[PDB]
Amino acid sequence: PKQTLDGNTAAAHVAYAMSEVATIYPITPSSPMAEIADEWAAHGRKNIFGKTLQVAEMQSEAGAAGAVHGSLAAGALTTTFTASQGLLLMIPNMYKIAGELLPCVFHVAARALSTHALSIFGDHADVMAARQTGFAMLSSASVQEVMDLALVAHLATLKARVPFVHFFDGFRTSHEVQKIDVIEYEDMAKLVDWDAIRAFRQRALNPEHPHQRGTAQNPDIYFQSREAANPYYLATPGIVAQVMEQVAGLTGRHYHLFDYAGAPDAERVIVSMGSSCEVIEETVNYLVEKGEKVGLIKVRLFRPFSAEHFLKVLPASVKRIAVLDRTKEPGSLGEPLYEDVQTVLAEHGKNILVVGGRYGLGSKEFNPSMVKAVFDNLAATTPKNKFTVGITDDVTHTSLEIKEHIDTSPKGTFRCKFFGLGSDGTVGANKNSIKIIGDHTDMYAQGYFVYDSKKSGGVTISHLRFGKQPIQSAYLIDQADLIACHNPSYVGRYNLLEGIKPGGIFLLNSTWSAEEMDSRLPADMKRTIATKKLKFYNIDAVKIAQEIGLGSRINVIMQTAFFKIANVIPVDEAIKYIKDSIVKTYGKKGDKILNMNFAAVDRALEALEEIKYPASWADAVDEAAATVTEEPEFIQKVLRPINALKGDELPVSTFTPDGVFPVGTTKYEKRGIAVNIPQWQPENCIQCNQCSLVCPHAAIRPYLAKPADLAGAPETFVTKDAIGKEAAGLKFRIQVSPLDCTGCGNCADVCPAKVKALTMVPLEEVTAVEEANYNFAEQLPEVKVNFNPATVKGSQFRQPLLEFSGACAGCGETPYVKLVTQLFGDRMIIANATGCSSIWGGSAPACPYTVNRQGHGPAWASSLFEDNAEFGYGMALAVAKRQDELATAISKALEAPVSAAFKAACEGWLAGKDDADRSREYGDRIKALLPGEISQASGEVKDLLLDIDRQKDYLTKKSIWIIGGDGWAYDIGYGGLDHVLASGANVNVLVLDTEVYSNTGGQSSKATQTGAVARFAAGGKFTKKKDLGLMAMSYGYVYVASVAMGASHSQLMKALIEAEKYDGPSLIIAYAPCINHGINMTYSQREAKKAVEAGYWPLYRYNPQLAQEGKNPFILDYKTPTASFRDFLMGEIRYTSLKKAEQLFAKAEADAKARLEQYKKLAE
Amino acid sequence: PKQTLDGNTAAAHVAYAMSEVATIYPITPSSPMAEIADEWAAHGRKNIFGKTLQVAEMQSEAGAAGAVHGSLAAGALTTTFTASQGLLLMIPNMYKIAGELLPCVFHVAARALSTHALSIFGDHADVMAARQTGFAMLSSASVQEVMDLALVAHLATLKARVPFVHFFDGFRTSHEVQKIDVIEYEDMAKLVDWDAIRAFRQRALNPEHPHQRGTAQNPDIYFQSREAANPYYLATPGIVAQVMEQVAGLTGRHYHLFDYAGAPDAERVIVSMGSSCEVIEETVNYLVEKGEKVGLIKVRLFRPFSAEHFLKVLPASVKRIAVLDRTKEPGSLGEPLYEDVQTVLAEHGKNILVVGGRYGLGSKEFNPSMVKAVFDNLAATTPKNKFTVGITDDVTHTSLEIKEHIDTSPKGTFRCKFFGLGSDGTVGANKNSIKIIGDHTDMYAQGYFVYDSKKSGGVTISHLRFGKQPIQSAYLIDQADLIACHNPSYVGRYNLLEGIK
Amino acid sequence: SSIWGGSAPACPYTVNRQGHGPAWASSLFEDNAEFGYGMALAVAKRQDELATAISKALEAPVSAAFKAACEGWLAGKDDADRSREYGDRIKALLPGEISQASGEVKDLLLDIDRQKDYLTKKSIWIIGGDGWAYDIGYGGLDHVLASGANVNVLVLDTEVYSNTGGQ
């Protein structure tokens, strides 16, 4: 049958049918494969064995790989899905699985490896890192090929006994939606070699016919034993070839080990692999028809590399070959595929000039214009070798010049771009539009979706294609017949109408009339509309949704507007298909919700009005650009073009060679995405600063100023007298940053005044006023104040060093990290695990960590997902070594003829170098005496002072903070965290416990509670939550504390300060509410208060220092809960969606009572 | 000075001098490096920074690799020692360390990977599994070369900012005892680019001049950012070449990225790497004196592979080349070194018949009789390609036939075999005899020891050599001048007098 | 435990008088807990295929003594003693039951006989040293314990890395 799927679903479809067990672990962009396999098993989909697939989630891909190995050796057909860093961790087991000749298929959504930077996007770096393990390797070039070649892999591995890696390009194919022919399970079972399966069962570990495998071997037999598998690898090419003929007879689609396309007498041929083959064949069709003698060899079976099957499809007329590798091996002579082609042609004496290049790293665009550039390089007198395509390499001059732009799209193919807002329904509607068109017409349909790094308020760009011919355009849309803008704020911000065809359609969602078009639309946009004679349509979708009662949801409205003008299908047919999908989507919502969406369709058709623009729009002239402010060179050359969606134009000379970025760059973004912003009521404010404490974006802060410093304040900068003996004679004001606020509403909810001192007002109404207000508050001079930093009020007067990050509105993680920077950020180094905290904390080119007025601030680094604890441990060793080198130079200065005041500060530092306050005090004293002491010295004594000055950045004692999520701490990095805590080093571990893998969409974890439903746990998690805090207490010398900011501000303050001062390992497990819980983020602080009050989350502190004082180390800070446990679960969707459901809710309540009663015994 | 050491001690000697931190985790046969580095720190040996090396043991080599990254990024020169399954667990962090251009040297006693079976013995499977991480790769063929090239790696990585894997063959060199010239720490400090060290400190993570590293990047900038390190890899070959000249002027021993030995008009040449280069050169000396036009190219800097330095030492008279790889990549068209040689010669239009083979997997014996078989295959009318040497492959017919047995040991070299019992003192005594002879004579001394898998009561066979010429015989004793049997039970049980002259 | 337990060419694990005995496998140093976990999942999968073929035999024209042992095994397939008792009854009645059957009934009995090596409930044993359990494999050992699977982990604590020399 025909369905609209992506590569992931296409792969999981075949993997599910052919497997009994699937051990999985989430990693983008492979996790959708494991998610859908869990849902199918949850609803009882049967594989070819008549049973449901058993899905088991491990603690890491290393654990997943071992489970695959054991399951295979014991007699169960087992598969798994992974990519990128996950595939690296499976490499050790891959040698074993291949070495033991076990049938197996790994499905890989090929993704780049973390080098100078992390990239979740697609290339072959991961697959190439395992090409020597002995696995076979099969490449799929399209979503249709994923369906077919996944079947080829599963059938071939049973026959050959050689395990397979079936890989397809991450995102470019794994997330591309296409209408394909789906192969029925019943047809798969008719092709399976059942004799091969039964032989596999007989080789299983079984005590009734036992055997020994995996022995240790001496040099006398190891080499021979390793070569004994030679026949199995020699027979694999023919086995795969015969399987491809089986699939060919069933589907009609013919695959070979290497496939050729292009002129039979071609002289220039490109050898490539993966989705690039689709782009190359489309270009080859275009060039061959124009008379060029070019061709393409698609590599399907990369390993084992069959020389016979490669030469079989190479035309005898080939004189020059360009090999394209989607990877980079630095310092290597050439990339993998290039060296293979060069080798095989040498082994057979072919006089063919071979040239290799690199493309598409990290989902870099690879379009037909680049393909011609590769072909033109083969047509040159001396073809450039070791080249790159798709970048401008102005440093080493490896890039090919893209001279001209060609349009190789098949005639009759419709192309549309949709600019949407984060979670406004645009992407979901386009997926439904593809499903509508694919199911009811003969046209092929394709969809690809570009997402934003910002988690809330980001830009989404949808790329859709429909045509009478199969769609091989695995690249972004170049010339669009229709461009739709579902957010009017994008007008004048992004190049929306880029590349639109003459006479194309421009659909806009805005409240602007035809006359307001002259003043609202920019001149460059008006020129394109007029010169290209576009059909410009406008619709006020927001007005329609308000009047009907759908709020601001415009997804149904904008989809109706598309079909009305696109002329892809009859307008009357589309309306039926839209309303039919509404019944499928809103049928269970009720009669009221159903008819509202029906009215949305009807009202949208009548409201879509074509804008009749004057022809004089073609001559419009840009308006004079204002005098731009002097911004740093990085902001001007890097951050602005990247946020302007022009980062691909930046040449190689723009970037550092090691991925090092400046700090404090998010303050230049000023996204202004808030719908409402807090307005401060000075008369109701008690000056408690709790609003600044809970802000997940540091958008609201308190400001103090002497009355003289309030001179040039705007009239709206109303201040109040400062409360407290510390701030006597000063003015106070709570000021919000309107362009950086997210409109989450946490600060208004936490305000404890009798009358609310914060009220949510629309941004547009007060944006002009509050911007000048914030610009004045930010320019206020520093005020020396003696407020105790150990209190909530006093700590918020210190500058936040984490601001304006990309976390969601109301995130429960950033308030914890923001508070740490306010206490110790002056002297801390952060080792941050991969996860949400690394995405909002370190997504290029914007850095949310900033500096104070002295230029000091946290240094931030992210290594890997699994190594963060050991990463920070290594930092502690190095910092200790750097202080030791400084202490030696200071002790040498004591014997030098230096000033008596210099010797006093040196001795004071040497005695207190391991104390935070004393080392800063005497450290700053030495800094003040350094310039004068150097001037008064000469010769070797001056050199000794210059060495101290070179190391003055290590006088102040540092504070190592190891930050990461619960998935890192409870699963993949738990072994390393256990080791670093047990070592006794002076490190501080902060676990942001969201009880799921939050960044990757919300998958199951050991931090997930009993009965909670998450991805990979569709039926709910049976086993209870692992108690990480209890295991760290078992050492006795590890400080462990469980905190929750929403529950108790004072309890969080005490545990953080006690943990940092403790000269040893400290573990802070913080409850972080998240969007994956299925709750209203406006009341994110309130949800954490209900969690502790209902006995769901405990609050305790284990202080090893109390044991040395003869006291009880365990202190239970909240003993008696006052709220109902069952009522808290019903306030989050992650528990209500389960409603077998009642049995799990009862087990969760029994575990919460036993956990509280166990803490009462440890406290008594 | 001259001391009797093994490859492990020779490497740890240099690693200790040039490093401040060493995060370690045990794995045969690399753990002796971390053991002896731990003992030196306990007795207060000073490095070139005047302090003792800080040794930290982790929960695994993956934890060790992560600790290296953190220590380097925080401003301390850090090293580690690993092999085989341990190096695999370090592969993820190697991408980060190489990607961030951090100076570093991993010392690896190259050991086979666990496939159909575990093997603690030596081959290049582990090092080849990381050849795409972006680390440089430097191969030493003897105990003396371990001393010298470990210094080359530590000096080169500071200058190039490209991290190095300095690897030597497990057991065959890591546990081979030889009398070598030991390089003084004071002489090492006279060659260090101290400007490079201070610059490395300035890039460290520090809150007083903060920065962000290890970001996540979208498709708009990732490709460009990955190619921005191209100058650093292009400059690494010349940096290594110049560093080798620094060591050359100090020690008198001349290393190059690729070294040539054999007839200047040779027509058959073997390209190889590791301890096989010693065995091949010894055989080449024997064949060249017999009139055969044969030669040998030793690969020192495997990555980055400099085509210019490789073609520089390849005689124009070469017609046929046999490449020997000490690894197996099942299903691959050819093994790594074979594909590099095949590629570079194709890129330069050389009409040279190239043939690749596999040898010495899991410390399989590789002796001169096998080397001649490789040369004889190049002399055949149709040379067999994709071959094996040292085994009898009667299934797929890849093995070369060992036609005749030759003795290529330099004349005047004494050779002794000692058959001992487990822990009866024989091995320790032979080691002491080597130290006695090495410290008090002008003779070179070599010791290699075959152990048993049984922990108590096993058979041990010691192979010792002494001669007036340097001992390149990285293979078991073929013709012994003396054979000693320290256990009468072996009489009638084992072929003790096998091969005695 | 893998060197004295599985160094080629000698295997110390042997079989009993009936030819049954422990099947031995070693994967890697770090993955042993998850290794045995995967085996437990597979054996459970292999028992389900046999149990389904036995339930089909209840509805087939076979002898009453054959059906009596099948119902007894299906009720006690997860008990060590009961599954062996009724399992051996099935094995003893199989050759005669196959002789008295034909067609699809004979094929259904031949499928029971093909899987009779899964009648007796298996005992998965995860054996390793203190280095595996306390260090490199602790994360995997922690996970398999949390899963609740019916596995038996035996940690031979020598308080050192005995094989590699005593680290």
Ligand SMILES: Cc1ncc(C[n+]2c([C@@](C)(O)C(=O)O)sc(CCOP(=O)(O)OP(=O)(O)O)c2C)c(N)n1
């Ligand atoms: C070894 C390994 N395995 C899996 C991953 C994928 N991966 C992540 C990314 C950022 O790399 C990604 O989304 O691509 S983030 C992530 C889970 C994060 O879970 P945590 O609970 O630790 O942090 P939070 O995101 O705050 O919930 C995973 C599994 C990874 N990066 N490395």
Ligand SMILES: Cc1ncc(C[n+]2csc(CCOP(=O)(O)OP(=O)(O)O)c2C)c(N)n1
């Ligand atoms: C991944 C990996 N790292 C290191 C090694 C080397 N190695 C083999 S056994 C062993 C330690 C065994 O210690 P233990 O778990 O206590 O078992 P024991 O020998 O003491 O019985 C090590 C480090 C290895 N084989 N694999």
Ligand code: SF4
């Ligand atoms: S509404 Fe949310 S983002 Fe805006 S200032 Fe308040 S807490 Fe911060």
Ligand code: SF4
């Ligand atoms: S929470 Fe309310 S009372 Fe407290 S400082 Fe903020 S606005 Fe003022």
Ligand code: SF4
């Ligand atoms: S933790 Fe949850 S709320 Fe915070 S950024 Fe991640 S997904 Fe968004």
Ligand SMILES: [Mg+2]
């Ligand atoms: Mg989490």
Ligand SMILES: [Mg+2]
């Ligand atoms: Mg032990």
